[PDB]
Amino acid sequence: PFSLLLSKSILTFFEKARLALTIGLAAVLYIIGVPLVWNMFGKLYTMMLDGSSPYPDFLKSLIYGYDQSATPELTTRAIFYQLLQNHSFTSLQFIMIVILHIALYFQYDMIVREDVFSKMVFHKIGPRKLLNVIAYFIIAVVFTAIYLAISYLFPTFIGFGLLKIYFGIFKVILRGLCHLYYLSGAHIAYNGLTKLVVDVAMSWISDHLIHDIIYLYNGYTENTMKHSIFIRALPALTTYLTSVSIVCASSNLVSRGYGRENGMSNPTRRLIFQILFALKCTFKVFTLFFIELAGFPILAGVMLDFSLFCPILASNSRMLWVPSICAIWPPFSLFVYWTIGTLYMYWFAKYIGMIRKNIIRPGVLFFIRSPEDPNIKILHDSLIHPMSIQLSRLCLSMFIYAIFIVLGFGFHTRIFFPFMLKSNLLSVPEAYKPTSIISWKFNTILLTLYFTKRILESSSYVKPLLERYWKTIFKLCSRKLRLSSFILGKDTPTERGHIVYRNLFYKYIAAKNAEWSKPKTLEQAEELFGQVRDVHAYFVPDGVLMRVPSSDIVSRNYVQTMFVPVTKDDKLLKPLDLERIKERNKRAAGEFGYLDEQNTEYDQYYIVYVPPDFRLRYMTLLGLVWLFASILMLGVTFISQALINFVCSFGFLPVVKLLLGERVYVAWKELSDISYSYLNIYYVCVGSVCLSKIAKDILHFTEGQGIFMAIFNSIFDNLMVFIAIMIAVIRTMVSWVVLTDGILACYNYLTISYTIGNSKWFKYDESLLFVVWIISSMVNFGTGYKSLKLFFRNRNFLKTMALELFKQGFLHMVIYVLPIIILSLVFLHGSRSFTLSLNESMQDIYFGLLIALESFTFFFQATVLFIQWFKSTVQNVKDE
């Protein structure tokens, strides 16, 4: 009986130990060795390329290598604190490489799978165990060595000569052409600029900027500008770009010679042509889809930063703000810009969508893309059209967005208030200016803004008010700017025709009187004014009716035949040619112009009125829209802040002054005294929600506390990982401290310090702490694995899951902290650390209690083990 149970326990323990050793060895070996061998081979190859070593001792040249601004040190701490950065560097490089390769392959597969690529190529060509783990590391090392050798020695070796040739060509062309042009016809320009104003100011900053280019050029040609990612990456970049250009040019050149009337009969050339064409299309589509999704949001974020976030949160003298807060990791500045840009695009799209289907007639916005768009192929349309047209469209869109963002926000927060009005009302005070991304002044603002957005979004009775305001101001603007019919649909004849009074001086001063003083003609009106001095007004339309589309999703090949003057009987005033239109369509369509099918279903035309000089009246409208949006935003913000300041200061402050003495009160008194001339985010948010309630009441006439969390619960239906991680860490922290505190108890007992003194020689103050930390880390890993498994298994429902997590967390925390609490009660680190440190110095009872408490803990563990062992034996008995 006992022998069988012992044998079974030994077998189970041996199997578990073998499995654990195998998995630990595999994981540690891979995750640690492979990146480190990658970095070692990279350093070795860079050293071989350069021809010399930074430290002409080999070993010190492999840990630091070319790392500048880092004094070397051979201590173990100074090696452990350095070898983590190398691992992070290699991990990041591998992640980027893998992501790029995956994206490229997926794009190529999607392009090849399309049904138009076959037609395009037809047009172009024409008709016809421990040992296993050990062995799986050497192969990875060899593959890393080979891939690194190829991809980091061939491109650089070719790129050296490529940069030599490029630099020579550029220098020759510059020195020739620029100097020839300057010597020929620049004397007059120099004479004019000598005393035009400017030359000193322009040349000073020009040579200052030109010095940087000269400085960078010297760094590459003379090996002094090492330790920089750019200077080391440039030859590989140029080699890859030249290879891509050569591939595309070779595809185009091989394509030539044959067409649809004389196909290719050589099977060898067909495969080469197909692969080259597929690569060309993959590169084109990847560039086009990368620009719109990553390059434009980042630029928009940078622009929005420089225009709005720097003048308010930071000082006005500086240009950019984001690079300062994220000084811990500068590359992380690339994510904040993207987030800001995409949020701006999302909100602008929402606003445009609101205006589209409520106020303006359908047809005034066809250049912007439409969300519904039943006949919209995002990928098939990106292959047919050439690259130039799409690039031009993207550039124009970016320029328009630049005008909007920069002009609006910059003029409002940089030139109007700080200079023309001389006020700080858009400047956060000094004491609450964010300075870092892991502080409280930033997190509080972020959370307040997010929760105010949540409360104001799903609240109702505000969107109808916004729509009413927008409709009213649009009616007001379009009734006066003469664009009554073109933009809205409704119209009155009185909008067509501007009259002239008796005299310009009379018209300017007495326009109403002249109006108070029957269509006609300009000559007839002049004759009547010159003959009878009684009619100070006339009527002459001076407007032409036009033909406009009737939907925002009309076909691209049809818009060309619209926008032509039409008389009152649906008859064209002048004939419209067709040969020029056909030639323009053929030229703009490209070679594959006949591969595109146009959905000519939603194709109608309206009859509207357009006023004379129809190029400034639809820019004044945008100006007025900007003005009114700014008025609304500024009014809301200032009113909210003023209302909250009034309420707080004339409410709570006297109450606190009466209850608590004139000594929390101090901070609230200063914060409510500068807010009369500065901006406050929290007051603005609170006033915004209060005004939301008030405006809901106003709209009702002319969600108190419960609906808030009601919607929040549905929103939250992040917490699964955070709760488990915190609970596991808290238990680990208590266990680590208890183990550290328990370790010192033995030293005190040993002193009662011969053994303690003898042990202290071999770093006894840190070995026990390290062992306790390792044990606590292992326990935390096990607990976290168990918690993750339980959460995945258990994936009203939230309350039950929260109760299970709370019960598990509370039970572990209570048991772990109970011995500490009992020790703390007996005392009333900690007592053990005090006893250890009291080498130069009641306590007997406390010492006895600690020994007694330790015995109880050991006895409990042994009883559980005996019960667990007996349970295993019972299962073994049933099996036998």
Experimental approach was cryo-EM
Alpha helices, DSSP H, located in 186-266 = 187-195, 199-221, 229-255
Classify each residue of 173-183 as buried b or exposed e, where b means 16 or more C-beta atoms within 10 Å of its C-beta: eeeeeeeeeee
Provide DSSP, 43-85: HHHHHHHHTS-S----THHHHTTT--S-----SHHHHHHHHHH
As a whole number of angstroms, the distance between CA 738 and CA 813 comes to 12
Distance CA(158)–CA(223), nearest Å, equals 18
CB 491 within 8 A of CB 497: no
For residue 572, give the 3-state DSSP assignment: strand
Tell me how many degrees the CA angle 802-804-806 measures, rounded to the nearest 5: 65
87 with 131, same domain: the answer is no
d(CA 813, CA 821): 12
- Beta-ladder partners of 610: 544
Per the document, the length of the chain is 880
Distance CA 507, CA 6 (A): 115
Tell me, yes or no, whether 94 and 161 share the same domain.
no
Please give the sequence-ordered ranges of beta strands (E in DSSP) within 600-751, or none if there are none: 605-610
Query: How far apart, in whole angstroms, are the C-alpha atoms of residue 332 and residue 330?
Result: 5
Q: What angle do CA 421, 427, 428 make, to 5 degrees?
A: 160
Contacts of residue 768, Cβ cutoff 8 Å, sequence gap at least 6:
740, 743, 744
Residue with tokens 């050439």: 386
Specify if 828 maps to a domain. Answer: yes
Q: Residue 344 is inside which H or E element, if any?
A: helix 333-358
Breaks (C-N over 2.5 A) in the chain follow: 56, 128, 197, 517, 663, 702, 717, 752, 795, 828, 841
Angle in degrees, 0-180, between the axes of helices 463-480 and 617-650, rounded to the nearest 10: 140
Domain identity same for 833 and 705: no
Q: For residue 542, is it within any domain?
A: no
Contacts of 462 (CB under 8 A, 6+ apart): 456, 692, 695, 696
CA distance 475 to 483: 10
The residues pairing with 607 across neighbouring beta strands, listed in sequence order, are 547
518: in domain: no
Please tell me the distance from the alpha carbon of residue 591 to that of residue 543, in angstroms, as a whole number: 41
Q: What is the resolution of this structure in A?
A: 3.6
Return the number of other C-beta atoms located less than 10 Å from residue 276's C-beta. Answer: 19
Let me know: does 766 contact 853? Beta carbons within 8 Å.
no
Residue 520 domain flag:
no
Contacts of 685 (CB under 8 A, 6+ apart): 448, 449, 452, 640
Q: Left if phi > 0, otherwise alpha if psi is -120 to 50, otherwise beta: which for 560?
A: alpha
User: What's at 496, amino acid-wise?
Assistant: R
Answer yes or no: do 751 and 864 share one domain.
yes
DSSP-derived letter for residue 547 is: E
Residue 1 lies inside a defined structural domain of this protein: no
143 and 253 share one domain: yes
As given in the structure block, the two tokens for residue 409 are 């926000």
Q: Is residue 694 a part of any domain in this protein?
A: yes
**Which candidate, 618, 637, 853, 866, places its Cα nearest to that of 745?**
853
Question: Based on the domain organization, do 782 and 645 belong to the same domain?
Answer: no
The phi, psi pair for 554, rounded to 5°, reads: -65, 160
Q: Which residue has the tokens 């490029």?
A: 166
Query: 147's torsion region: left (phi>0), alpha (psi -120 to 50) or beta?
Result: alpha
- Amino acid (one-letter) located at 20: A
Query: Is-contact 144 41, C-beta < 8 A?
Result: yes
Same structural domain, 473 and 616: yes
Q: Would you call 35 exposed, middle or buried from its count of C-beta atoms within 10 A (0-12, 13-18, 19+)?
A: buried
CA distances from 566 to 464, 494, 496, 545, 557 (A): 38, 20, 16, 6, 20
Angstrom distance (rounded) from CA 466 to CA 636 = 12
Contact at 8 Å (CB) between 823 and 851?
Answer: no
Instruction: Return the percent helix, strand and coil in the chain, to nearest 5.
Output: 75, 0, 25
Q: Which helix (H) or strand (E) holds 763?
A: none
The b-or-e profile of 54-85 (16+ CB within 10 A means b, else e) is: beeeeeebbbbbeeeeeeeeeeeeeeeeeeee
Distance between CA atoms of residues 123 and 255, nearest Å:
10
Nearest 5 degrees, angle CA 153-CA 154-CA 159? 100
Boundary residue ending a domain (667, 690, 717):
717
- CA-nearest of 225, 131, 269, 1 to 876 is 1
- What the block records as the tokens of 431 is 């004491």
Residue identified by tokens 């035009």 is 196
Contact assessment for residue 566 and residue 572, using Cβ atoms and an 8 Å cutoff: yes
Same domain, 196 and 64: no
Would you call 541 helix, strand, or coil by DSSP?
A: coil
Q: How many CB atoms lie within 10 A of CB 590?
A: 14
CA 643 from chain centre, in angstroms, equals 35
CB 678 within 8 A of CB 427: yes
Domain count, the chain: 5
The two three-digit tokens of residue 718, written as one number: 């992040």
Mark residue 103 as left, alpha or beta (left: phi above 0; alpha: psi -120 to 50; beta: remaining). alpha
Q: Which amino acid is at 254?
A: V
Distance, CA of 226 to chain centre: 31
Integer CA distances (angstroms), 146 to 41, 142, 151, 302, in order: 10, 6, 9, 40
Is the Cβ–Cβ distance between 690 and 640 less than 8 Å?
Answer: yes
Beta strand 544-549 with 605-610 is antiparallel
Owner of token pair 């550039």: 395
CA 76, CA 78: separation in Å to the nearest integer? 5
Distances, alpha carbon 166 to alpha carbons 217, 593, 680, in Å: 13, 37, 56
What is the span of the domain harbouring residue 471? 438-483+611-717
- Please give the structure tokens belonging to residue 363: 């047809």
User: In this structure, are 95 and 128 located in the same domain?
Assistant: no
Return the amino acid letter for 425.
L
Q: Where are the alpha helices (DSSP H) in 752-842?
A: 754-760, 764-793, 797-827, 831-837
Residue 126 falls within a domain, yes or no? yes
Q: How far is CA 683 from CA 441, 641, 674, in A?
A: 15, 5, 13
In a domain, 432, yes or no: no
Q: Is the CB of residue 641 less than 8 Å from the CB of residue 592?
A: no
CA–CA distance from 377 to each of 294, 414, 505, 597 (Å)?
A: 21, 43, 60, 11
CA–CA distances in Å: residue 406 to residues 302, 305, 509, 722, 752: 11, 10, 39, 40, 76
CB atoms within 10 A of CB 423: 12
* Residues 179, 135 share a domain: yes
Interatomic CA distance for residues 633 and 508, integer angstroms: 34
Locate the DSSP E strands across 384-509: none
By CB neighbour count within 10 A (0-12 exposed, 13-18 middle, 19+ buried), where does 185 fall? exposed
- φ and ψ of 675, to 5 deg: -65, -15
Task: Give the C-alpha separation, 181 to 204, whole Å.
Answer: 22
Q: Are residues 237 and 119 in the same domain?
A: yes
- Please give the span between the terminal C-alpha atoms of the chain, in angstroms, as a whole number: 10
Contact of 556 with 597, CB cutoff 8 Å: no
**Greatest Cα pair distance in the chain:** 135
Distance CA 845, CA 784 (A): 38
Angle in degrees, 0-180, between the axes of helices 229-255 and 199-221, rounded to the nearest 10: 90
Give the residue from 493, 536, 494, 539 showing the smallest Cα distance to 515. Answer: 536
Q: Which of 670, 691, 717 is the last residue of a domain?
A: 717
Q: Within this chain, do residues 57 and 126 fall inside the same structural domain, yes or no? A: no
| 3-state DSSP assignment of residue 794 | coil
Integer Cα distance of 123 and 384 in angstroms: 13
Q: What is the dihedral of CA 131, 137, 139, 144, to 10 degrees?
A: 180
Helix or strand (DSSP H, E) at 414: none
Last residue in a domain, options 698, 717, 736: 717
